[PDB]
Amino acid sequence: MTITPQNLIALLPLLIVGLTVVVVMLSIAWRRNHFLNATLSVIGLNAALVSLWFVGQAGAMDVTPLMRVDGFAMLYTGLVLLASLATCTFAYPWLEGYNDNKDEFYLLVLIAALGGILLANANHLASLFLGIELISLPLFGLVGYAFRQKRSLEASIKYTILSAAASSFLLFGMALVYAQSGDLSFVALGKNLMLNEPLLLAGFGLMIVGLGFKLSLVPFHLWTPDVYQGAPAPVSTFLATASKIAIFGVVMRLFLYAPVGDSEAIRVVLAIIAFASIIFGNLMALSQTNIKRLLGYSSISHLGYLLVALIALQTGEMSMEAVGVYLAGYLFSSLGAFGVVSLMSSPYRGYRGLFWHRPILAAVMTVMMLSLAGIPMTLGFIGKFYVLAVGVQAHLWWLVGAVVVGSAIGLYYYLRVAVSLYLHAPPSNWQYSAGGIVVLISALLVLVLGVWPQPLISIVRLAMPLM
C-alpha cells in the first residue's frame, strides 16, 4: 500500500501544522520577533482549522497502517486546535512580560498541537505512543518555560520524571501486548482468541497505568495540582484542555476498535478507577485556597466522569456522543476559567472581589464555575446529563451514585469560588482585549449551548466513525 494524493488531502491539518512549525522555526532563526512568530502560529492553526472542511469533504479513510481519519478524528482535531489557539491567545499578553526569549513558546505549542492531531488520527499502537510523547515533550518545555521561577522548575522536573516513568510503563505494556498478539494495529488486539489471557491483560493494565497518568486518573493523579500550579497559566490551559482531549480520544479509539474492550476484568478495574477518581478528585478540592490546584482536582473529577461515560461504550451506542458533548463543554469551561486566570496573571512579573475592578472577567469566571458544577443553563450540565444517561442505560449504579456525590462536592467548592468573586476585597492593549473576547465567547457559547444544546448534538453525532 502506498500514499495517494487523497491521503495527503486527508492529511491536511498534520501537514499544515508541520509546515508552520518549520516556518516559525525559520522566522525565529531569521530574527527574534515575538509578534511575527505569534501571528504565524495563529495563522497556521487557523489554516488547519479551515482545512478540516476539506478533510471532511474528502471522506473517512485509513491513511497509513498507522492513521485513520473520520469524523471522530475531525472532531478531536478541531477541539485540540481550538485549545491551541486559545493557548496562544492567552500566552501572548503573558509573554509580553517575559524578560527572556518569547518565541519558543509558540513553536512548542504548535508541536504539541501536532501531537494532539496525530493522537486524534491514531489507529495504531506506534501512532498512539508517538502521539503521547509528542504531547508530553513540548509540555515539558512549556511547563518549565519560566525556569527562573521556582515553582515552574518544580513542576517541570516532576512532570518530566513522572511522564518518562509513565511512558516506560506504557511502552512495556505495549511490548507485552505485541508479544501476545503479534500485530500493533488497533483492530487486531486479541483477534486470535477465551478473551482473557494474563499477558494481554497485564499489557493492557500497564497501558492503562500510562494513560491514567496522562488523564490524571487515581492513583496516578498526584502530579496534577502540582504541575497545574507550577506551570504558567496558558500552559495550564493547554494541559487542562488539549492534552486531556487528545489522550482521552485515543483511549476511546483503542477501547472501541479493539475486541479487548468486551473483557469484564478491564471494565471492572476501569469502574474502580473511575469511582476512585471522581470521589478523590472532588474530595481533594474541598479546602483548596489556590485556584490552580482546585482546577487540577476538577480535571481529575471530570476525567472520572469521562471514564464513567467510556465504560459503557460496549453496551450502549450513545456513549461516544456523550463523551464528545462532555469534552466540548469541558473544553469551553476550562478555556474560560483558565483564560480568566491567565488574564489576571498577565503580564508575567518575576480573585476575591474581582467584580469591583474587572466585572466582565468575574462574570465569565462565575459562568464557568456554574458550568463546571453541572448546573443547568450551561454546557457542563448537558455533559453530566449525557454521562448519567449513559451510566443509567448500561446499569452502572455505583458510578452514577459517585457522580451525584462528586457533583454535590463540586457544587460546594465551585459555588464558594463563585460567591468569593463577588465579596468585598480589603491590559489597555488589543491582545489582552482579544483574550477577553475569547473568554467572553467561551462563556456565551456555554450559556447558549446550555439553553439550546441541539446544534452541538447534531455536530457531534455527525462526527461518526466506522462502527
Added chain:
Amino acid sequence: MIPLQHGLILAAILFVLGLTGLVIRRNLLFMLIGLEIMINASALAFVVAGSYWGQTDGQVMYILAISLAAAEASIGLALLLQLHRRRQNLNIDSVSEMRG
C-alpha cells in the same frame, strides 16, 4: 529455539530494577539513569516480541523508544543543570515547596 518467556522475564527484571533505582535513589542523576534503564528494558521487550514473530515492528518500536530516550535524557539533563545552577545541589526531596 530460545523461549520468548525468558526474554520477557529478562526485560521485566531490568524494568523493575530501573524502577527500583528510580524510587530509592535521591540524586536526580540516578533517577535519570533509572529512567534510561526502564526505557531500555521496554525497548528490549519490544525487540524480543518482534523477534518471536519474525517482524521488523519490534525493531522500529525500539528505534522510536530510543529516540524518545535520547530526547527525554537531553531534556532531563537540561532541567537537572538548571536545578544545580539555581540550587547548588541535586537533592530531589527538597523539591517539595508545592503541597496541599
Added chain:
Amino acid sequence: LLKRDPLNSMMNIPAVLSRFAGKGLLLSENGYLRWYVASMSIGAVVVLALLMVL
C-alpha cells in the same frame, strides 16, 4: 432536648465525613517526587493484581 435540631446534625454528618476524608486525602499530596513514583508503582501493582484475580 430538640432545640438543637438533632435531625439537622444527623444529616450534616456526611458533610463532616466528606471534610475529614478530603483533609485525610490531602496529606498524600506532600509534594515529593519519589513518593509520586512509588505511588505510581503501587497503583500499577494494584491494577495488575485486580486484573489477575479476575
Added chain:
Amino acid sequence: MLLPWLILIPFIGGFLCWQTERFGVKVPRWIALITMGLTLALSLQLWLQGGYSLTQSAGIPQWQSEFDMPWIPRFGISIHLAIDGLSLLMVVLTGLLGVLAVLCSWKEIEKYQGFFHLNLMWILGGVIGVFLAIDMFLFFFFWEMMLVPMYFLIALWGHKASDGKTRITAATKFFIYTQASGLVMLIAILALVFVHYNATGVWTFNYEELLNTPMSSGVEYLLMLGFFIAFAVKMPVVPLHGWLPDAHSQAPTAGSVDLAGILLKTAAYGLLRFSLPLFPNASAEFAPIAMWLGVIGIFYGAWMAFAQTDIKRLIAYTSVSHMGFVLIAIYTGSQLAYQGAVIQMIAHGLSAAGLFILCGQLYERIHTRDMRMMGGLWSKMKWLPALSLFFAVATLGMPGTGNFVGEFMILFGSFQVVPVITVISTFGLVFASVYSLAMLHRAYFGKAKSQIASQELPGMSLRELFMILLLVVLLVLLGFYPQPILDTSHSAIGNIQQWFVNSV
C-alpha cells in the same frame, strides 16, 4: 399559547430591570411592578377564560391549554407546557406573591438593585415554569434553574446583621440539598425514559407518553423513591429539612426572597402531578411511610417552632409543620383530602407571606429579631401587632381563614382513609396552637425586655398596610367562601385521584 409568554415575561421583565438600571435607581422597581402586574393579569385572564367551574373529569391527561415546541429532538425533548385547574391556581398564587415580593422591597435605594430584581423575576419565572411544564426534562430544568438566583440572592443580598460566612453557608446548604435532590430526580427520570424506550422504542420525555409504561415492582418503587426524595427535600420533609430555617433566617431582610422563592411549594404539586400518576402502585405501597413522615414532620416542626428564639426561624418551622399536614394529605387517595391539600397550600402561602412581611417590618422597626429582646409591643406600634395577631391566629388553623378549611378537609379525607394518623395530626394542630400562642406572647405581649422596645416606634406606611390588608381580606374570603377555589381545581384533582385509585 399564553403559557410560553406566561413564563417569558418575568424573564424579559428581569432583563429590563437590569438594563434600565442606568436610567436611575428608582426605575427597575417600577418595571418589575409593571411586569408582575402583567403576569398576574394574564394568569387571571386564563382563570376567567378556562371555564374551570363547569369542567368535568375526562381522565388523565386533561389539559385546559397546552403548548408544544421541539427543544432537543434527539431525545424527544420538547418545550411542552400545559395548564389545568391546579396549575392555574398555583400560577395565580405565584403572580400574587411575586407582586407582593416586588412591593415588599420598594424601599431599597441601593446601588445594584437591578440585578436583585433580575434574580427575583428569574426565580419567579422558574417557579412558574415548574408549575406549567409537564415535559420531564423541562420540568427538571426549571426546577434547578430557579435555584441559582436563590443562592445568589441569599448569599449576596441576604441578612445584613449576619456575617458573610453564615449567609454563604446557608445558601450553599440550600443549594447542595436542592440540587442533589434534583440530580436523583434526574436519575429517576432517565431510568423511567430508558424503561419506556425498552418497552416501546421511541424517545419520549413527555409526561403523557410515560404514563403508559409497564414497570415491574421494585423498579417503579425506586423511581418513586427518587421522586419522593426530591419532593421531600423541597417540601421539606424530615430529616431532609435543615436547609429551610437556615435559608429563611439568612434571606434578605426585606422578605421578598421568602415569598417569591420558597413560600410556593412546588414539591406538593410535583407529588400530585408526577409522583402519584406515574407511580400509582409504588405510591400506594409507600403511603404508610410517607404519612408517618408527615406525622413526624408536623410534631417535629411544632417542637422546633416552640423552641426558637428567632421569629423567622419559627415561621420556617410553621412551614415545616403545615407541609407535613399536606404530605399526609397527598398519600391518602381521597377527593376531599386532595382538595383540602390544595386549599391548605394556598392558605399557608398567604398566611406565611403575611407573617414574613410583618416579621421583616418588625425587624426594620426594632433592628433585632431575637424574641428575648422584645415584649409588650402592642402599645408601641399602630398596626403591626394586630395584623401579626391575625396571621398567627390564621396559622393555627382558625375558621374564617382558609387554613382551617384546608386542614379540616385534609383530616376528613384522611379519617375516611386512615383514622390514627388523623387523630395524631389533630393533636399536631393542638401543638400548632401552642407554638402560635408562644410566639404571640413572647413577641408582642408582656413588658419591655430591652430599651428598643421601651420607646414609641414609627407606624407602617400606606403601601405595606395596603398589601397586608389585601392578604388579610384574601385569607378571610378563602376561609368563608372557598367554593370558587374548590371548583377551579375540581377537575384535575379528580383526574389524579381517579388515576391513583383506579389502577390499584
